[PDB]
């Protein structure tokens, strides 16, 4: 009984989190009211990892919904699987965060953080053996970025020896709400560099290009972007929900404590020629292709420290090994040669809803430094002129704190750069 406590904070965090519980609830045969109605025991084997079992064989997700304004979580409560969440696990304010990291982390968020931790403590205490935590949020806003990182900090204080895992949506000027996103993202990345064991970097620009160029969606929406994040979140967690361990995963994926920012990938990504079968070579060629990755980083600009793949569906496991060992042995210049056998492959028999077989890609690549470089550049472009700083200094923050975040992220890039050589 290795339980995971899930937390979703802010607009992005709850909208992406909502669809995640909608996707896996479908895979485990849980309907919108928590009643199981599947046809396979594999669906219930690892069901307690993400679900609590209530009276009457009801399964309630182990999720804590957090936000500083009531709007988004009212949507979740009214959405498809809204009724499946525990009423007491909705913790929210009324002031909002104004896309301000200082408001979510020091002022507004600080007033609300304790009531969230009471709910976390309530869920952890009822866990037979808590694996760790997973947080979904964006870094470019205020609540999921500012307060999200405040939560991670207070969770690591109370549970220092539990794994802290996040799915983090990185800002991008292409799909950007406010100009202060570089500020909020830079301030959060430093928190994540210190207090998370694994962070899956999701770039809205990558999610956009996939929806535009690959999926052929003329006008992508946030909903379309979240469908990709749901499908990815379901893929990376397949090892945890079906017939392994968060700490075991971290051990084999993270060779250096600060370089724990992953690039995920999904395959297939077909446009509506959607019924055609996808051979194992196609799953493998696409899964490693940059166009299938959501970090908006060209892996051919760096090197993989470690790579993990999960294949879902009834396929030729012998042919899986042949194709994976073909991508490695045909591009080994992009894999560091000082970590032997740093490419691992796993198979799961249950495919996602509506796919005969799929493949999820998880890579610890030094190409991710390109993401932090872009953020660092946008940060400096405004900070050199102190543009929009008054929004943050008005919440008690000092310019010194910005100068440090800048340096912290530039040190992070220097660290990635040295292992790429």
């Amino acid at each position: 009984m290795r339980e995971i406590v899930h937390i979703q904070a802010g607009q992005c965090g709850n909208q992406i989190g909502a669809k995640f519980w909608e996707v896996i609830s479908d895979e485990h045969g849980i309907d919108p009211t928590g009643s199981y109605h599947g046809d396979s025991d594999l669906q219930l084997e690892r069901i307690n990892v993400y679900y609590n079992e209530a009276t009457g064989n009801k399964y309630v997700p182990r999720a804590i919904l957090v936000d500083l304004e009531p709007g988004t979580m009212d949507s979740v409560r009214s959405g498809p699987f809204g009724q499946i969440f525990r009423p007491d696990n909705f913790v929210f304010g009324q002031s909002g965060a104004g896309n301000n990291w200082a408001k979510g982390h020091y002022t507004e968020g600080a007033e609300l953080v304790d009531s969230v931790l009471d709910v976390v403590r309530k869920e952890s205490e009822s866990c037979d053996c808590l694996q760790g935590f997973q947080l979904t949020h964006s870094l470019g806003g205020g609540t999921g970025s500012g307060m999200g990182t405040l939560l991670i900090s207070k969770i690591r204080e109370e549970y220092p020896d539990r794994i802290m895992n996040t799915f983090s949506v990185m800002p991008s000027p292409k799909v950007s709400d406010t100009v202060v996103e570089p500020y909020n993202a830079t301030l959060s990345v430093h928190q994540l560099v210190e207090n998370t064991d694994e962070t899956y970097c999701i770039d809205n620009e990558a999610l956009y290009d996939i929806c535009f160029r690959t999926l052929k969606l003329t006008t992508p929406t946030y909903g379309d972007l979240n469908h990709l994040v749901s499908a990815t979140m379901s893929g990376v967690t397949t090892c945890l929900r079906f017939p392994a361990d968060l700490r075991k995963l971290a051990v084999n994926m993270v060779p250096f404590p600060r370089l724990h920012f992953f690039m995920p990938g999904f395959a297939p990504l077909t446009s509506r020629q959607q019924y055609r079968a996808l051979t194992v070579p196609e799953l493998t060629q696409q899964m490693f292709d940059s166009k299938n990755m959501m970090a908006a980083c060209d892996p051919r600009h760096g090197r993989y420290l470690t790579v993990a793949a999960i294949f879902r569906g009834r396929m030729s496991m012998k042919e899986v090994d042949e194709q994976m060992l073909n991508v490695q042995n045909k591009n080994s210049s992009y894999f560091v040669e000082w970590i032997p056998n740093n490419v691992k492959t796993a198979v799961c028999d249950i495919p996602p809803r509506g796919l005969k077989m799929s493949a999820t890609f998880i890579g610890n690549s030094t190409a991710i430094q390109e993401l932090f470089k872009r953020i660092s550049e946008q940060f400096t472009a405004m900070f050199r002129r102190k543009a929009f700083l008054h929004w943050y200094t008005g919440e008690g923050m000092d310019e010194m704190e910005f100068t440090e975040a800048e340096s912290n992220m530039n040190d992070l890039v220097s660290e990635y750069q040295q292992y790429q050589d």
Binding site: D245, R247, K248, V251, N252, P255, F256, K318, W338, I339
Partner: protein
């Protein structure tokens, strides 16, 4: 009669332990409920099979075994599997979260908290023995429990049972069946701290078992069940002398005597033949010479290496089935004139031979076919040092960058224990070279 307590540590040791004890029951005519009709002394006796099974007043034959794992999902199979009735609950010990492939986590962090409990359950088994021989310890090199808790258990066993022999069955890490990148660290950490505490250790390279399963058994993608059943045949061959009437390797002390002239060099190479697919229409039964000659084919060694370029310090031939000494010597003579068998000048050029007339037992519905005769060769070649070289090299690649080291330091291990352990393996590699090279 002297008893042998088997200890299974980690997932690899528990599942291999499960496969062996299943085979032992099939060999000794013991049913899943623990009953043994052929045993006419109800609730007692000092037969050869009593070295591995105790008896209750109710005629139950209980393995002298302890299963230890830091996480419970693997032992729970034993608790509810076919042979759940053989063991009582005190013999099955499971924690709630594993060592996460982290040696330091199994040796220090978790091991510290569970070591005295294991020693207490083992003491209970020892209290049923009128003359305990020692322990057989099954574990993996790569797992965090298999490596980290095993080495702590060996250190304590040397304290609590100083005059008892300890043998290992160690699973050498292979990328084809492992998803852990840090197993080279764990393998070298545990070999370092276990070396002075183990009298004789049988390494099984998962890479070897895997190809034997693909090649001889035509299993395109073998599973742990396939590997474990094959591994339990070799284990059964190696422990048969302790469980059956005989005169060769009749107690654990005789393994070091016949196979280990130098204490540090206590890693015999195991070679088994024949392995025949049960799905075959029907195989031509191989002769004593043919299966003996197969013992010098790299393709059926438990560790892939080239004995033609090492030196033999010892050599045991353990035959099971329709074999008479006349055929053995005929095959040996023919093999000397053809093969490359160079012994160390300070060791005789001979072969200790043991024959057990009962042919190998095979689990029904298994993968191995029923053969009329089989042999398992135990030879102490310097050629097995290749396995240390390979493993030591992978260690060096990662340790040069300190990759993954923070995970061990974070559990309380000092970084110097890495270099101290690597230096010990470098010495171990030097010993093999001083012995087998001119």
């Amino acid at each position: 009669m002297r008893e042998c307590i088997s200890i299974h540590v980690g997932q690899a040791g528990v599942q291999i332990g499960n496969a062996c004890w299943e085979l032992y029951c099939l060999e000794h005519g013991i049913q899943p409920d623990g009953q043994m009709p052929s045993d006419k002394t109800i609730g007692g006796g000092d037969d050869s099979f009593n070295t591995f099974f105790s008896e209750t007043g109710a005629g139950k034959h209980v393995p002298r075994a302890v299963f230890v794992d830091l996480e419970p999902t693997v032992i729970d199979e034993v608790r509810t599997g076919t042979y759940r009735q053989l063991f009582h609950p005190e013999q099955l010990i499971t924690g709630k979260e594993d060592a996460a492939n982290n040696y330091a986590r199994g040796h220090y962090t978790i091991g510290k908290e569970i070591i005295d409990l294991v020693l207490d359950r083992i003491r209970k088994l020892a209290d049923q023995c009128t003359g305990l021989q020692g322990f057989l310890v099954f574990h993996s090199f790569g797992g965090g429990t298999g490596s980290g808790f095993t080495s702590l258990l060996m250190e304590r066993l040397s304290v609590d049972y100083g005059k008892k022999s300890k043998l290992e069955f160690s699973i050498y890490p292979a990328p084809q069946v492992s998803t852990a990148v840090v197993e080279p660290y764990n393998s070298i950490l545990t070999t370092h701290t276990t070396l002075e505490h183990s009298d004789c250790a049988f390494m099984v390279d998962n890479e070897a078992i895997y190809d034997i399963c693909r090649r001889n058994l035509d299993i395109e993608r073998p599973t742990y069940t396939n590997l474990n059943r094959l591994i339990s045949q070799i284990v059964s061959s190696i422990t048969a002398s302790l469980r059956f009437d005989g005169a060769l390797n009749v107690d654990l002390t005789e393994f070091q005597t016949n196979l280990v002239p130098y204490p540090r060099i206590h890693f015999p190479l195991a070679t088994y033949a024949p392995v025949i697919s049960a799905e075959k229409a029907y195989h031509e039964q191989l002769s004593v010479a043919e299966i003996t000659n197969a013992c010098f084919e790299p393709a059926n060694q438990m560790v892939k290496c080239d004995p033609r370029h090492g030196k033999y310090m010892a050599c045991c031939l353990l035959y099971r089935g329709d074999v008479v000494p006349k055929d053995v010597n005929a095959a040996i003579a023919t093999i000397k004139t053809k093969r490359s068998i160079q012994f160390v000048d300070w060791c005789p050029t001979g072969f200790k031979v043991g024959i057990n007339y009962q042919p190998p037992t095979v689990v029904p519905g298994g993968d191995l076919a029923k053969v009329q005769r089989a042999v398992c060769m135990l030879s102490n070649t310097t050629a097995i040092a290749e396995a240390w070289a390979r493993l030591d090299h992978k260690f060096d690649l990662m340790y040069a960058k300190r990759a993954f080291v923070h995970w061990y330091v974070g559990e309380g291990m000092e970084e110097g224990e890495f270099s101290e352990a690597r230096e010990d393996m470098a010495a171990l590699e030097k010993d093999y070279e001083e012995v087998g090279v001119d």
